[PDB]
Each structure stands twice: as structure tokens, then as C-alpha cells.
Design a protein around this ligand. Sequence first.
Ligand SMILES: OC[C@@H]1[C@@H](O)[C@H](O)[C@H](O)c2nccn21
Ligand SMILES: OC[C@@H]1[C@@H](O)[C@H](O)[C@H](O)c2nccn21
Ligand SMILES: OC[C@@H]1[C@@H](O)[C@H](O)[C@H](O)c2nccn21
Ligand SMILES: [Cl-]
Ligand SMILES: [Cl-]
Ligand SMILES: [Cl-]
Lengths: 652, 661, 654
Amino acid sequence: PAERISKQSTPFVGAQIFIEPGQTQEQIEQWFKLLAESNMTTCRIRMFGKYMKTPSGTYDFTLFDRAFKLADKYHIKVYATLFPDTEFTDVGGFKFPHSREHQKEVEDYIKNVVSHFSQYKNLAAWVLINEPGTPNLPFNEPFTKERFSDWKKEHNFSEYNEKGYPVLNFEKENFIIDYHNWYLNWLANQVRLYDKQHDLHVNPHNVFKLSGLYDFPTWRTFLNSLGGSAHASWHFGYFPRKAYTVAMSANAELIRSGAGELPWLMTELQGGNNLYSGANPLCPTAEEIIQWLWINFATEAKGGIFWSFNARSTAAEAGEWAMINFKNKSSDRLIAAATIGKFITENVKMMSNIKTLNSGISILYNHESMWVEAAQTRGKLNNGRSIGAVMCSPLSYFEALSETGLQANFKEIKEFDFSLNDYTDQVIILSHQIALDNKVIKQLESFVEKGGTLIADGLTGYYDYQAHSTVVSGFALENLFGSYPIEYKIKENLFSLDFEKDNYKLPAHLWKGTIETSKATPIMDKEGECIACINQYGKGKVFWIPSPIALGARESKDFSELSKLTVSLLPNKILNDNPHFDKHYKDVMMKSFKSNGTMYSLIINKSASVQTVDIVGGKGKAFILFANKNAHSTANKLTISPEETVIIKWKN
Amino acid sequence: SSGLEVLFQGPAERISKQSTPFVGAQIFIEPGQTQEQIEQWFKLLAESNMTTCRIRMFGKYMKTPSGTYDFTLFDRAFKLADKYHIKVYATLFPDTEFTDVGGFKFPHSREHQKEVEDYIKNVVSHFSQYKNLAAWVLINEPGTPNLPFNEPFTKERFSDWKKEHNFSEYNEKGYPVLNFEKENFIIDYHNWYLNWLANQVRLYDKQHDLHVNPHNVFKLSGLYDFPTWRTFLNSLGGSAHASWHFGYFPRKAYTVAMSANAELIRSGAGELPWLMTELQGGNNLYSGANPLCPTAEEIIQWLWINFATEAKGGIFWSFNARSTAAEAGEWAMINFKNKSSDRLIAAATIGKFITENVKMMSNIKTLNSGISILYNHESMWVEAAQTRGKLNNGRSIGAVMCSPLSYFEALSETGLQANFKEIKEFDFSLNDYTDQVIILSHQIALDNKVIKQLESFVEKGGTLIADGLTGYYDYQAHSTVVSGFALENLFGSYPIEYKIKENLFSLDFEKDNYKLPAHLWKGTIETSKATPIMDKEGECIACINQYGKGKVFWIPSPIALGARESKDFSELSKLTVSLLPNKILNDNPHFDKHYKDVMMKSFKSNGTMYSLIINKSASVQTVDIVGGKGKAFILFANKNAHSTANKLTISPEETVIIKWK
Amino acid sequence: QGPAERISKQSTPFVGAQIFIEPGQTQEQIEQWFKLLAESNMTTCRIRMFGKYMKTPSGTYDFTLFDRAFKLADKYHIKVYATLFPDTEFTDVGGFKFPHSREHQKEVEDYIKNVVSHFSQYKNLAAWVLINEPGTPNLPFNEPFTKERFSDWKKEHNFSEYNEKGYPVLNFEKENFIIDYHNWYLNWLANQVRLYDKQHDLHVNPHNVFKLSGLYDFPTWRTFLNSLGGSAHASWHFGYFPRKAYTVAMSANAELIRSGAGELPWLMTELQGGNNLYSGANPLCPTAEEIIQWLWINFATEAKGGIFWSFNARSTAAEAGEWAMINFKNKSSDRLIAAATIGKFITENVKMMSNIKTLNSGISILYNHESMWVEAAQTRGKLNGNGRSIGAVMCSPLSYFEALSETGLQANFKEIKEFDFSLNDYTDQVIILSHQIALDNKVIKQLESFVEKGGTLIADGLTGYYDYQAHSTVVSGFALENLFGSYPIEYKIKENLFSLDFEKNYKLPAHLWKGTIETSKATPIMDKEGECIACINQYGKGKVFWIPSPIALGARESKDFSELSKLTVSLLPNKILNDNPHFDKHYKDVMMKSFKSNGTMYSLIINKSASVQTVDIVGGKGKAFILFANKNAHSTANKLTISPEETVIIKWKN
Ligand SMILES: OC[C@@H]1[C@@H](O)[C@H](O)[C@H](O)c2nccn21
Ligand SMILES: OC[C@@H]1[C@@H](O)[C@H](O)[C@H](O)c2nccn21
Ligand SMILES: OC[C@@H]1[C@@H](O)[C@H](O)[C@H](O)c2nccn21
Ligand SMILES: [Cl-]
Ligand SMILES: [Cl-]
Ligand SMILES: [Cl-]
């Protein structure tokens, strides 16, 4: 009898309801009443073990009963997060058991909480753990140390590869993937001992840094939905604030890819102000709240839940993050969120059946490029010679395509389907993916042979998965690229690649690559060096430019040339069938989606000026369905104000 | 006690609020110095109108191989001081590593405590017999940013303290709390060790004054319970070194830094006399955080600021230099030929002025405007928990002290005195607070008890000015802004939101096109009983509550930090003056308008009023002095200042004393 | 006696490169490297004799991987410098600097026995490198072998906490132990090799010398070496310089090693041959022009070789595909083409190139270990760049060195114990002591003797403020009063950059501290503020110029060496300016150094400015003939027109 989320569910707007001792019945009722009046249907509650434990060690559920009963009274469904006892100062929760004894305390917590709260008819989902993964993994603790020792003994690694060269085996990184898989699957199995009825959910976080911890295809085996925390103040450090549209779109695409056939939703969005908390503190504008909800729904999200409706009262984040003001009335952020909840109720059929319009462009990242980069840059936090270049590179291509109004997937390489017979009009972008193995190179050969277009820039494929450079021993991509690297020469943080005949002046970052072509067509620069090539490989094509041009775009804060070059390489079908911009627009984004056979476009202007965007491609005439600052169109030229969000319905 | 403490006092001087102030210097004594070198120092010190020296009684340089005490090195120095009629402040400094410049702050172990007992017995029993001993300094510079929680003595003391205190993880209403056990222990631990050192000295000498020099006060004030220290001291001192302690200020505002440091120590002293135990006397080569060599002009500025703030002395670190490793040939007032620098010549003019003006200089009482800028330990502790030790700025350690120092600077540039006091040092027991003003600037932690004291203060005619996140938290880091605002009654209003902005933004008021620099966070409120003040966006950003006979001005944006970030205190000056009771502006000499980089402070001696004026601007200034009564007579000026009818013409870096006739 | 030539000061210099040998490489790849190395006019390679790649499971030594490389070297007539490199973690790029334990010392004994006994039999072995890059900033005081050695050393030394006069002192036990510990381990490695091979040269490569010179006792090392080497990598070792002054850095590094070598020949064991991808502190890819500059600077400073790290690249993890002179197709980069031109020049000019003697101007810039140790105690490890940071006691003398380079004057760069203070006459000799903050009574007596016998002494900054125990005689009774004929009065801290304006009309940039003095016998020099800021003392036949403000660090901070150049030239004996070719005036970003071979004088000129320069050369005798120029330089009389990044050799004809 519990409702099960699906790809046909009506999306919801929701908020964390922060429950701690000291709150009154009257305060909590005020929150649920305003939450229901704000067109929110869902809340999330942290089921703190600390606030159910009695002196004698029995479980007292009264604090959480009070909240579940008020949610039920106001017809609000609950996402219940399993959060066992931990220090009051531990804001995010522990990520693994400390010890075998602690594992047994967690077993007991799950037994007690799931057996009790599974009986409430307004329970919508169990969140297995808050925010799996951390930059500070507990290798000091006995539980983790023992698990890592056992894992190493069950794996058979050599210090040399088949040809006899030294290798790195990345035991720690490969263990951490398996360790997350094990603990999340164990938590799922524990819940399922007591409740087989309710959805299981989890919220990976800080995905542009922690994606190397996460094996989403394995997690699909035990989840009913994938979530995510995407907080502007913690997770978007690689972007300026005016590009948090791009950051949220990439974060949504990354989760959507991880989810595969499962529905996804954004478990945490920033609902309010940073006083002392956050790395990049802000108070989201009402305009930002609208931008984030639409970007997520346009990327197939089945929900957006804000951290938080109400604030914590003591120490860390006291009076921070809240959508309500200190009088428990609506901020401009809650008023904005309420307009989106209202829009959904008035447009149920459209909003329940959203499918992202895939351009056929996939930007791929792999765990192994991140792991090899961490070994080579020895943890430096400065450019290409720092942690993060292997994620900033593909995010920069993502930004360039967003400013061209083109959708792009953002996927771990294992989430891409390499099993099809035809890849005509499909495109893969491998931007500074410095580690590729023989198995993945065979998949890319098959993809291109069957009509795929491959774009590769930066140090893509310089190393294999053992940090062995085939560029030195015998280049594994020679066959596919129809060419061979000659040299990298370090330059300044920003330099220009000036193509022969002035066809392009591409900003580039740090390293200039030169190559020698065999089967590929060489592209020369004005200094007479070969800096790029195009290989015809079976029915498909490869464009290779071994200088970092996506990081060059990032460093110059100018994506226009990267946009123009990328558009010139795209199959005609992509530009004919997908609405996009007639040219590059700085600080504008568009993404299109379909619902029940009708096409829609989402447009957001993040520039300081009114913009007239000329939309070309696909079919139909613009009908403005949503526009929070009175945008207007003349033919398919959209006039859109700073910070405005527009939804166009494409008619016949 | 009066006739009894006079029989204890014996032939030793007892410092008092009527003592003649002195100028003095550290005499640095270490092995290898010759009789002839040491005599040269005392002779020049006496000829420079200095009457006092301070000597570090190094345990290291008295300990013999067998463990007995040899006093010869210090006897030689005390005898030469006595020959030249120089009195000695003797610092208790037990044996420690040669590389430990400042000295240990607590015993390392029970065994170490017994070595310290033995040191005190030997040194006090011997040197108490010299007729030129003026004071015992119980410990050099109590307190440190790096407290030794790793060491067994401190670890055990903290364990015992926690067992004797009963803290709950929840408050009366049931909310989670922080108890700040570490910070509350550290207060009690400093109180305990200093009181124990006093008790040890008093076993062997009940005649001589006990003294101590708290240091780096804008950072370490959260370690110091001055009202408790009054129980066992005869005088409070201080180290105020331009190169270590004034990092929150540029050099051109070290006048303001020294005035604030003097006001902070004066407040801590209460009924006890105070003096500045350490002022910077010379050059930083490799030492110091903000290195300098004080100008002759800075030496004169610092001595007058301290005396105008009731100091009974100024002692310079140092007359002569250390010779080996850390600070070798640094900090000295004498040059490498053992002759006067321009700093010693300048200090000598102040010693000479005192001898020619004894009655005036012995009876200085600061002219209290009635403005008190209040800080509390708990705001500093809560800030340290919330900013997780970040070291920039409102989101960093130090905002809770920089905010009140900014108000202090704004008032200095208006020529108005202000007290700078820990909230426990403020007298909340009076029946009438008409024409008194309290400024609570970003004092983020206030408890129910202190809010009741503020309600009483305002009800009885007090004016309360509150800016920044004042009262956002209680003493357990619980925000009543979230649970039910404890200042709603007093403020007649309730916070609505904080929204983070840039480091510097403008508050643009609805009326008069009026603009205030603000830092980092914009506060909005809803008024009940208070009168709202709106901004151009139609949000309420401030209010005035009329509460009994007094008033409250509340602006929950940081406008003092806004003034600091913009490097412009003029608007904060104008706003504060507009909120002051008329009596303050009528009775106190002040500037007719704000003067950037000028300061004035007034004081009284035997019924005559005086003003101290210092110009730190790059230009000659004509300052129009208004308020109080009398005609300007220039008593002191080091660059030929002149007045025409209370308009003073004062040169860059000049220090002026006006006598009001 | 066996087949290998023994290096000497008359050896023909060579160009060479590291050949990086690891498992996985094919016979065909390795042959391609040696063939191209021989075709590039290189005669020498260096090979890291990795213990890891000779150790078998059972603990026996299998030499096959290295035999293959030695046999291909021999086939192409390439001689080998073999570096002793015992087993260590794959991630340990540089190698361990001392044994970890007594048990580890025995494994190293066994490694040396096996490797030296076997490879000593190859006729193309030229040298044993005793250890790669002795010295580290992070000495292993935590490990049992080092801990025990330091305990024993302290028990055998008897230090007092007070000096003779009774003042407290520092004794720098750690620093003094580290000198003796390097001396001991290198001498022990030499003795171990000599158990099995008395025939081949022993070599070692000190590194990062502007930071690690305080670890190195070169005069002791001469007792067990046949040659001194050095690693001088633009991406690791030249942090104190901008890239446009790596000419000055390499010349100073060469002078420092040349001084250390004394009567031994020296060569540069490691020069940067290629690109930094992820490695290096100051990453670059050397230009062809930089390769030519570095080889000529070293040869002009008496180097008997330049070996590049590396010919070919490592393949896995740290430095994979980095540092290589060949490209990823195993063909010549523009760096290898440039190096080949120098190897070809040597073969066509053997008699000249085999007999190079640097033309000593008579100027010696002196540094001492003790100034570096005292600075480390006083700055408590601060890294803020300036006088109040680690490195000022080396940056100060390097700044004087740069000022003299831009005047076209040679200068020695020597540890004070490497200077010969035993001569009877120092007429027309000059010593520069720039911010050498620690001097003891023994060295002051040597300086008194030097000046008395006709020497000129230039002292700036805090020179002589402290003695070797960090005790300031400036405070207790100034030990240099007699020599300087004057006494310090005050130091007053100022801004990072201020001006010293003489009453008569030098305006010298100065850094951080202004010193004032009182003269007795010396002639005072007053500034425009009426303060005495410097003096000239006539002492016996010589003179002293003392300016206790840091004017070399002032030049560095202002990026302007012109005033320091003009002042220094005005103080030099006439004979130096008459007998040595130099520039008629200061030239920013140009350098010249002169040398002699078999009675003929030559000059090396390099232009590092952005523009073509016409340099007027004066002093010495003869007419300029351009022997080498890589960008078509020309001379008219003795005015050389030289392009940006060009290296020129002039032969002086008369
Ligand atoms: O920091 C604000 C909130 C936290 O209070 C909470 O643990 C939540 O899960 C979360 N993830 C990232 C940020 N946040
Ligand atoms: O640093 C100069 C002097 C010290 O030598 C001495 O210990 C003195 O107590 C002090 N407090 C702050 C600075 N100083
Ligand atoms: O870093 C490049 C090379 C190293 O691979 C090698 O160990 C060599 O000894 C060396 N010294 C300094 C730099 N280098
Ligand atoms: Cl939660
Ligand atoms: Cl003292
Ligand atoms: Cl080697």
C-alpha cells in the first residue's frame, strides 16, 4: 500500500524539517502548516539516534512520533534518514562503522527505527545514510584498516605489467569503491529485514570531488532511487556564482547518469543563508531557487528537497540554511519555491512525464583519471598541475555547450552503453581524461568504427589504469587517433593555439602538445608545428588536440572559441533536430526536454544585461509557458532579462 | 586593615592612585657582562630622568651545579641600581630553556611546581632585603595562544576541574548546548596559578607590591579574569608592544591601539593602580610580527596616552639588549656605544616634565565621557567555536574584538574618551544611568543574567547602542534568535533574516539619501514597540526603542566592521554623536567634527582639566575643540603647536597637552 | 691498471645524457637510444644501477638488464658513469641519503660488492657515482642508524653553554653532526668501492646547492673523490632567480662546484634535458638556446662535462614521459640538436676545449656554513623571501654575483674555508662578504691578514653581526672594529625597499634595515639625512669598504643591479679593470665571463634581454674574433652586437 517512486511520478518540492529536543508542539505544527501552504508535499527528517536513546539504552520514539503525526495531519510524506548516534559536533554523520562493536550498535538502531517508523502511512522513503563518502576516509580506524588488509589479500596484484614495466595498482582507491558498495548494500539489507515496502534512497554529495568514491551502477542493485546533495556553498567551488546554473545542470546530469533506469531526485538544495558555515557562502536569491528547481526537473528529477525548512538552534549552523525567517514566516526563497509547487499541480501531466532531450553528446569522466591525477600531482591544490583538472576540463566543455544551448550527458565511462550496433550522430568528449586502459580503448574503437564522433583534448590517454604511460612505451591510442604524440612543452597558465589560415585562435592552458600523423589529417599552427588531427576511422571520426583547450577556456573565462570549434565537429543531425542557440551566448544556458510527445526548452540568462537569444533547430513555434520576469519572443528570438528562467512549449 | 597594612608595608613603597608616575626600562642582566658595562647603563638611566628598572631574575643564572642558589650576578645589578637611586621591579622567572624567550606559563609537572616553590623561597628571601626593590612581578606575561593541554600537570588539573563541575548536554527548555569546559577551566587555571604565585611570594615578603603584565590583550583577553586578580595584586600591568600586539591596526593608528590597551588594563585594574610594564624601546631585526623601530615621536605619544589613562608608570623593553641568539642587539633604547638613541632622549623629556610638574602628574583622573564599549569572554569563545579557527573579517577569529575597537577609533577621531571594559567590570548596581552610554558591537554571546542587567541599565536612563550579531547566541552557543529572542523586550523588535553580502556593502536608508558602510551580513528586523528605520528596498534595517527613561539603538548589520573595512570612521562618528545624551557633548571637550588620524583624550588633576591631542595625519591640522569650559594654554608640545581661542594648530606626529584655564 | 682513462684538468670535455634503464624496455629501443646518442656527438652516458632491478626472489644478483645496456654502450663507444643506487621503494625518485639501520648498511655492503665486482670488468666504465644527490632538507633523525650516530657524535664532543667571556652560546650540534655525517657516509661508500675497484674514478653530485651548501664540506670530500659533480636543474634549484637570470644561476652554481673541487676536476653530472609535465618546483621545457647557454657557462667555468637528465624518459608514475631530450618517437628534440652542436664544436677544437682555465678577475664572493646556520636559528624557518627569511645569506652574495656578471666581470663563489688565506701578497685581490651574518675570531684574523697584505674587502648587510655561536660582538664588543676602523651605532628597520642617497652621488637601493656607524680611523660616508651609513678604512696596504645596510638585497628587491655595479667598480683595484675584459658600463640581463686556453684568452657573452644589444668590451688586450655564435652575432672593433638568447665565444687575437 506504500507509493513506490517511478519515472512517471509527479515531481514534488520539499524541505528538511529539522527536529531536535527543546522544540514545542506549536513550533512544529507552524512549520508543517506553512510547508503544506507553500505547495510542498514532502519533508526529510534526520532520525538522530542521539535523540531516541534513553539512559538505560532502550529507544524512546516520542520526539519523532510528534513530527511524523504532524506531517500526516498536513498530508506531508517523509523521507526518513537513518542517522545513528554520533557526536553533537559531527554535522554530516559518520560514513562507516568505527569498529565491530559500533557495527552492532548500528544494527540495533536500524532494527528499532525501521520496525517502528515503517508503520506510519506517510513514510515515503528510507535514506540509508546521509551523504556517503568523505574527503577524509577513516584509514586510522580498526574496522576500515582490517577491511582494507583483507581486500588486498583477496586481490592478486603484481609490481610489473605483462610487458615487464613497473605499475601502480591503486589498491586504496579500488578498495574504497568496494567498501562504499559493501556498507550501502549492508544498510539496504538491514532495512529490508524489517521493511520490504518503502523505497530505499541515498544522496551522494560534492560529486565534482567525490565521484571517484562512487560506483553508481552497483548501487542501482539495492536502491529504488538515487539522490544527491548539490549545495551552492559547499559543492560548486570550481565555478563562479553566475555559473551555478551550469554547476547545477552538470550535477543533475551526473546523478541522472548514475541513476540509469532508476528515478532520481535532488535530496538536498541550499534553502537559506550562510552566517559562519559553507566554503563559498551565500544566501540564494529567489531567482536562484527557481533556476535550480527548473534545471533539476528539466534533467528528469522527481523532486527537489531544500536543506532546510527551519534552522538548527545551537552551535554549527544555528539559525542558518532556513527557508523560513526567524518569525517562522516565508522568506522570498520559500515564496519562489511555492510558485514551482503550484506550477506542478496546474501542469501535472507535462511535469510527471519529463524526458531530457539527449543531443547525443556525452562528456565522459572516469574514476581512474582522478586517481592517477592524485598520484601525479601529489595533492597540490593550486591549474592542470593540481587536484581537480580532470573534472574541471570536462565541466568546461559542458559550460561551452550550455552557452551554445545544447544538452550534454555527463557520465562515468562505465555508465555509457558501448554495446550498440550503430553510433551515427552520437558524440563522446574525453577532455583531459589522463588514464585510459586497453579495454576502454577497444570500446572507443568500436564506438567510432560504428559511426561515433570522438573529441579528445588535453592529456587524454597519456597513462593507463596503472599510471604507465603508453605514450613512452608504445601509444595505445595510435590506431584510433591515426597519429602519435611527439612532445609536450610547458608554457604559461594561458597561451594561444593559432591554427594555420587563422581558422581558430584557441585559448590553451599550461602544456602545448605536438603530434605526428600517419593515417590522420594534420592541423598545423602558425609556427609550423602539428597541434591537432582528424582521423576517419570506419564510419566515424576522431578530433584530437593534445593541448588543454577546455582548461584554456576556463583560464581565459571565454568559452566562445571552444563552442565554435565543437559545433563545427558535431554531426548535422544533432544541430537539425535539437533546439540550440544560432551562436555562442556568454552566461546564457538552454536545455530541452520532452513530455508526452511535446518538446520544451529551459532558458536562463545569468548575464548582467537583457539578451536576445535566436533559437534554431528542431520544429515548432515558441509558446512562453513560464517566465518570472515577463520574457517575450518574436518568431523564435527570445528576449530574456538578467536572472530570468523561461520555459518555452514548442507548438506543432 | 588601614593601620595594619601600613605596619606590613614597612619601608617599601606601596603604589597608589596618588603615586608620582615614573619612566623606566628593563635592565637585561645575563652572564658575561662586566661591572663597568652595567654601571654605564644605570648612570645613563639616572641621567635620562628614569627612576625605575625591571630585571628578569633568571633561575638559569643563579643555579649552581649542586642545586644551591648563587645571587652574585643579580646582587651586582641591585647594588648598582641602589647606588644610582633606581628602584627595581623584579620578575620571578624560574629556570627554563635558553630558547624560551617569554617563559613557561604553568608548571609542566608536580615536580616542576616544587622547583618553582624552591626558586621563589630563595629569590624572594634574598632580594626582599634590598631597600630599592619596588615590586615583585609574579610571572612574565601570563597566558599564551598555545596552552599546554598535552602536559601531565595541566591535563590532571583539567580532569579534576571537569569532575567538580556538573554540566548537562541540554538547557532548561531541552535544547542541545555547548558548555565551553576548556575555556571556563582556562580562566580558573590562570586565577589559580597567579594566586598561588602571590601566596608563595607572601610566605617570604609581605612588604612589597605584587604586579603582573597580561599581554596581547586584543587576542588573550578571553584567558584573563581581572576582577579575580584584584584579590591578590597591588597593581595591574601590561605588555603593549607595537611589534607583537597591535596587528589589528596600521602603524598610524598605534595611538588608538595604545589608548584601547590602556583603557582595557585601566578597567581590569578597577580600584588598583595600573602601569605599562612593557613598551617597545627599540629595533626589531629578526624578532616581532609587525617589526619597527619606534620613532622619538611614538615614544612621546605612548607615554602621554598611558599617563592620560591613569598609568603610574611606563617601562620600556629594553634599556640594553640581549647579546646571544633570539633578540641579540634588538629592542634597546641605547645604541651599540651604550649612548642615548633619539628614543631615550625623547623618553627623558617626559621624565623631566614629571619632575617639574609633580602635583599635576601624580593626581591624573581620566575624564570619563560616560561612554563604555563592552566586550565579554563568551563572545570570543562562541566566535572561536563558530569560525573553527579561521584567520582572516566577520567569519574569522578577532571580529568580536575588531568591532568594539572600530567604535573606539571612531570616538578617538571625535576627540571623545571611551571606556573599554569586560562586561563583568561594568557597575550595573547604580540607581541612575542618565547620560551613560553602553556600546555592544558584535558581542555575539549574551546570557539571560546580562540581558536583565542591560534592561535595568536602559530603564534607569542608559543609552544602549548594539550593532552586528550582538546577542545572536547565549553563553551555551544556543541562538535565542531561533528558539525565542531573549532581547525582544529590550529591543522592542525581532530579527527576520541575515543575508551574507560582500566584505564591504552599503546600507542605503529610505530617507535623506543616507549611507552606512557595512561588513559581510545585512540584518533585517520587524519592530513591535520600537520605531523602525527602513532602507530603499523597503526592509527594516534598524530601530530605536524608548524603554523606561533610556533608549536602545539596534542595527544588526556590522557597521563598526564596515567602517574598519572602508578605512573611514567619519559616518560611524557622526551617527554615534547623534545618539549621545546632550550632557556628554556639553561637559566633555571634543572635536567640533570628525578628524581622520587625530586623537584627543581629556583628564583632570586637582580640579584642573587637561586634553591630550596627537596628530597622526600627514598634514598640519587645525582642530576646533568644543565642550567643557576654559581657555587653551599649551603646557606640552614637541613641535611648537599654537592655539587661537580653542583652535589648536598641531603638526604631524606632534603630541600636545592643553591646560584649560 | 685496466682500460679506463682517469679524468684530469687536461681531459677533453664531453656532452652526455642519462640512459634510463628499467624492466619492460626492448633490446631494439635501447639500441635506438645509444645509436642516436653517438650520432649526437655525445661520448658519455650515466646509468642508475637500480638494486631493485637486479635483486632475485632468493636474494642473488642478476645483472642481465644492466649487462644489455653496458654492452650496447660499448658497441657505440659510449663510456658509462655508473650510479650506486641500492634497492628502495619505487616511489623514492632521488634515493635514500643514509642507511636506515645496521642491517640496511649490510645490504648496501652486499649491493656494492656485487655491482662493483661485476661492472668494474667493462672496459667502457668511466666512473662510479658513490650516491645520487647526497644531502636532503629532511634528514632522517627518526631512524635508528642516524639517531645512534648523532648520540655517539654528541658524547665524543664537549660543548659548554657559555663562551670564554661567560656569555650564553648556541653550539649548533645538529648542523656540525650533519657535516661530519655526510663526510663519514660518502668516505665509507668510497672505501667500499675501493675494496673491489681501485681503477675507476669516484664521483658525487651535490644538488640544490644554494639551499644545501650548509650540508657540504667539499675540502674533506676531495680526500676520497677523483672528481666533483653537481645537479643544476632549472626546475628544482634556481628558485632564487627568474628564468631570464638562469645564466647567472648556472654560472654561480658552476663557480660554487669549481671552488669545492679545488685541485680536482669537476663536471655537471645533471642538467635539465626536457619537459616538466607534473614534476619540478619551477617547471619549464628548456629552449634550444638555454641548452647552449648552460653547456658554454659550465665549460667556461672549467667543467670537464655536462650530462643531461635525461636522454629517454621513465615510463610509469613520477616523471613518466618527462625530462627527455628525445621525443616520444625516439628522435631528436631541438634540445638534443642544440647539445649535438656543442659536442661537434669540442671535436673540431680539442686543444682549446681540453685546457680551459677560468680567467680569475681576483674577485671572490665568500659564503660560510655558519651564516646559514645562524640565519636558520634567527628567522625560525620563515619563508617570506626577504632578509627575515631562510635564504637571505645566499641571495645576498648571489645578488653581488649578478651585479658583477652584468658588468662582464668573472667572480669566484666560494665557501670561506675554500679561500687560500696563506699567501704573502693580496695586492689587486678582492673579497666580498655580503650579509655573511656569522664570522668568528679566526676568520677575522685571516681577513685582517688579507687586507694588511693589500687585499680589498667589501662588506654589506649584517656581515659579522654574530659569531659562530650566534653571540653578537656588536653588543658585547665588536670583533671587526680594528679592521673596519669604525663601530656600528644602530640598525633601524625600514620598508622592503628604501634608498641610501650619498651626500656625494650614488643612490643605492637597500633592503629592510638601515645601519648607522661611528668612524675612528675610517673615512665616514654620509647620506643626505646627515647620518654616517658607510666608511673606507685604509688598513696596511689594503682597504675596507663597509656599508651595514643590505645593498645587494636592495638590488635584488628593486630588480636593478646598476648602482651596485657602479659602486663596486669604483672600489676595484685598477689592475683588475686593466687586465680583464669587462663591459664599458652595466648591461641589464647580459653576462660575460672570460677564460684562457694554452695562452689564448676567450670571452663568453650571453644576451638574456628582450632586445639586440651592442656591448662595448674594454680591458685586457687584443681584437675580438667570433669563434662561436648561434644567431649571427658580429663585432666592430671590440663592440659585440648580440641577439636575444644568443651565446657568443670571442677569441682575443694580438
Ligand atoms: O551544511 C548544511 C547541511 C548540513 O547541516 C546537513 O548535514 C546536510 O546533510 C548537508 N549536506 C551538506 C550541507 N548540509
Ligand atoms: O620580544 C621582546 C620582549 C621579550 O624579550 C621579553 O620576554 C618580554 O617579556 C616581551 N614580551 C613581548 C615582547 N617581549
Ligand atoms: O627529477 C628529475 C631527476 C630525477 O629523476 C633523478 O632522481 C635525478 O637524480 C634528479 N635530481 C634532480 C632532478 N632529477
Ligand atoms: Cl537527513
Ligand atoms: Cl622580566
Ligand atoms: Cl643516477
